[PDB]
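Hello again,

I reread your note about wanting to compare the complex against the isolated chains. To keep things tidy I'm splitting this into two emails, and this first one only covers the full assembly. Below are the input lines as submitted, including protein chains and any nucleic acid or small-molecule components. They are followed by the predicted structure of everything together. The single-chain runs will come separately.
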Amino acid sequence: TEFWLISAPGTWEKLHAATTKNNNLAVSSKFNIPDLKVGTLDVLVGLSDELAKLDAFVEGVVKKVAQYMADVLKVQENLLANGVDLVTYITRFQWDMAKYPIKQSLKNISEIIAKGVTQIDNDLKSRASAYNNLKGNLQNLERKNAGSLLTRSLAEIVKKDDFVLDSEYLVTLLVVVPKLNHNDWIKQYETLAEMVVPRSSNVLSEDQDSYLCNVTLFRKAVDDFRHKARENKFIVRDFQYNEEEMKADKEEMNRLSTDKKKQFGPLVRWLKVNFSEAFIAWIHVKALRVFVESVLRYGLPVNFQAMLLQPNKKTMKKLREVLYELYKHLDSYYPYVYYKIDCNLL
Amino acid sequence: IIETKMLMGEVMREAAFSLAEAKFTAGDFSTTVIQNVNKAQVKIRAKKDNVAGVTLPVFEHYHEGTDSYELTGLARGGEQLAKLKRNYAKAVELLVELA
Amino acid sequence: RLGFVAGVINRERIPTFERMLWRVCRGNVFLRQAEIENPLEDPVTGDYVHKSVFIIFFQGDQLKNRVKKICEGFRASLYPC
Amino acid sequence: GKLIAVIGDEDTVTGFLLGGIGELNKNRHPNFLVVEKDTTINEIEDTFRQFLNRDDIGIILINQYIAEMVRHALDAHQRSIPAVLEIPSKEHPYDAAKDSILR
Amino acid sequence: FPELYFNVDNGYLEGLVRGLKAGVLSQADYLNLVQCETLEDLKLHLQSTDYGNFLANEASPLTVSVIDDRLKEKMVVEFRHMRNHAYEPLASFLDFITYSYMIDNVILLITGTLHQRSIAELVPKCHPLGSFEQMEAVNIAQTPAELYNAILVDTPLAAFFQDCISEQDLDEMNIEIIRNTLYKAYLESFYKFCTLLGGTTADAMCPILEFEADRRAFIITINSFGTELSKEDRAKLFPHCGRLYPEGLAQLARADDYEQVKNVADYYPEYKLLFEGAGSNPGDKTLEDRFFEHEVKLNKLAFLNQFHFGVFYAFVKLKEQECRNIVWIAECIAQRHRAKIDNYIPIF
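Full-complex prediction:
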């Protein structure tokens, strides 16, 4: 959805109702704007370059929070103080307590706007990056429980009967052997090294390609067995009691799921209060930007004759032409004051 | 002295592993980089400091940056470069502070 | 308080000069044309064209940066009056 | 002293030339010296004498494995400028040479 | 029809280059090299494969740099054996592969020529595949690259220097631009030559040369953002050789942003799903760690075609992947930094 925003000064505030008579084009609501302090010419024109910098910047802030809303779990539920974006557009007022009318419009209104939304902006990049790390570690979570038995985490497959503990001279090494190499391994596991316990061949578990099995073996021959296993394509995976801390990673398999659940609520309530404040600030810089250049292109006896508009689809070509004839007779790129605002977020 | 000398040993270890990474990606640059040197991009200016009236010589670094390796790689690599440059400009950021 | 700058520009670029000046200054400027006769010559810019005079008051003292960009874009030469 | 000098190694100098410390004035010398397998101990000693006598050299980088050979030449240098540092190699890690000044 | 010949002249060299393919290290061979702890142990593990006893005479301290050039000297004498036996449908084809190394040796030779140094730069610091041990006038040239360019046309790269003004290489053009303009004219001349050869060596090779031009198209327009080269410069650095030629090369000339080269890569479904390298993720395969795996995928499919010359060019580009992988294994072992030791390219 697009939106259009045109002011037409030159009663004349009944002549915008004659543009509502063009009912085939738009609905053309008012968007009344309170008066702001005038009292400058020089830094007023210098302001307009900064307002050109601001609205292009702060629309980039509200756009990347829209693409971040897929991360929480397309959908349009962006309310603004219990209000949909289009129903706020017809009834938007400046707040006069968050952005005062008393101070001069140019710098200290725009600075507390800019300092405010940038403080929301850098807080967004710092907080959301922390929660994105937890799902990245949760991306490593199911990656540990996937693949073959060589690369999969072994936090569930263990049994204390399948190892010889009490380290004095012996140790069980976890060797994985392919299924096609089964008969060649059960004849050679005695002679891949010296002093092998020659009966310890027992198949712990299997997969569709291979099987996981155990060899009880002397502590001084763990390397020469591993070397000769690689020469005949058997793979040795070392094992230690950090699996008891991988039982604490089974806790972390539950912990990273719970902090995903714990931080999800605080995430969406952080987005809903900030982006609503960010979008309200995005409308307020438009009201400042339409306040300037409407006192330049048009006169300033006291104040310009304010009006605004309402969107259009697939008749915007004739809306431009019906407004070009009316307002090229006004003056001697658009021939009036105009600012394209973009209603859809993505 | 002792604390930042074991700190540059970790940075120069990281910069050395970056070097390997660059060579995996991008050919060999052990003649392109060596031949093309004309002027310096990182220089030092001696500043003065004091403790109890004893003038201490100290060094201050500055970049008159005209990149002589602005186009190195550029067809194969050149992404592993300009982060190997960043891993070594940060190294000479620290080695001047140590000196 | 202030608001004077004057210079020289060729006659063949005056129609697009006043239209571009009207656009980027957004009104609030006063330009009165004054035409000269048979061709003069600046050695490198510009050679052998008949030129004209312009008065760009503006009164702004911020718009001075917004007009010196225009005189260099149209390649004009201004003198201290 | 405005230049940084590096004696380094083959892989060391090509990382430091990418940092931006190399400079070739064709009159005097190059401000670096690539030390390969087939260069003598004397040639390292001459260029060490070159960088100490040069005015624009303020810092002298050198790998400590290369500095183990010219150690007798740098144990006599006891001035404040130019500073001489020992940086670790790709193979050779670290420890000696400045604490001779402090035990 | 183009298949019942080509065993007359090239029958012996097809089985010979496919016999060398079986010695390329497989996935099981790469697992044995990862588990090593010292470069001395890597030497004993390499003895099980075809490489065996190639580091027998070097030294007691085994540096990683002596592993590098001894790996690359083995593939040179494997390639130099094949070029001595190809009569002339294949000897000129094998000469085209060495032009990629002759370009990198020529630009290495003109730099020291501008800085007034000579033959001592040439012999130790040049690639042995595209080498200069013949045409001895190029070795005796110590002139400042104007009386040496007239010697340089005595060299089989003379057909590529017709877009190279002799004065233009005399410091008026940047030294990297003079590589990528030479590699540009090398690529269309190699694409046209493989189109003259018909049948199986035309659809097993030009799919590889289409992606090689688009590696050259994409990496140029990404690494030319911060530097002061114009868009008309990188537009003439694009090879008119591949899938992006009539449409994509125009859009890469206007980019100015990494996001704009991404969406013009999404128009091609093969070149998208390669732009998911995503270096914003802290540890992952980068954009050129994904371009390498697509490069060796097309070289691996070259061996499925049987009666064609593209088996030779794929073999050099896969044996070069061996010398990149084993050095990357040995540099993670010697630095004791085997946390990214799995980031190699497993071709077979």
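For quick reference: Chain E touches chain A at residues 28, 31-32, 35, 48, 281 (CB under 8 Å).

B.
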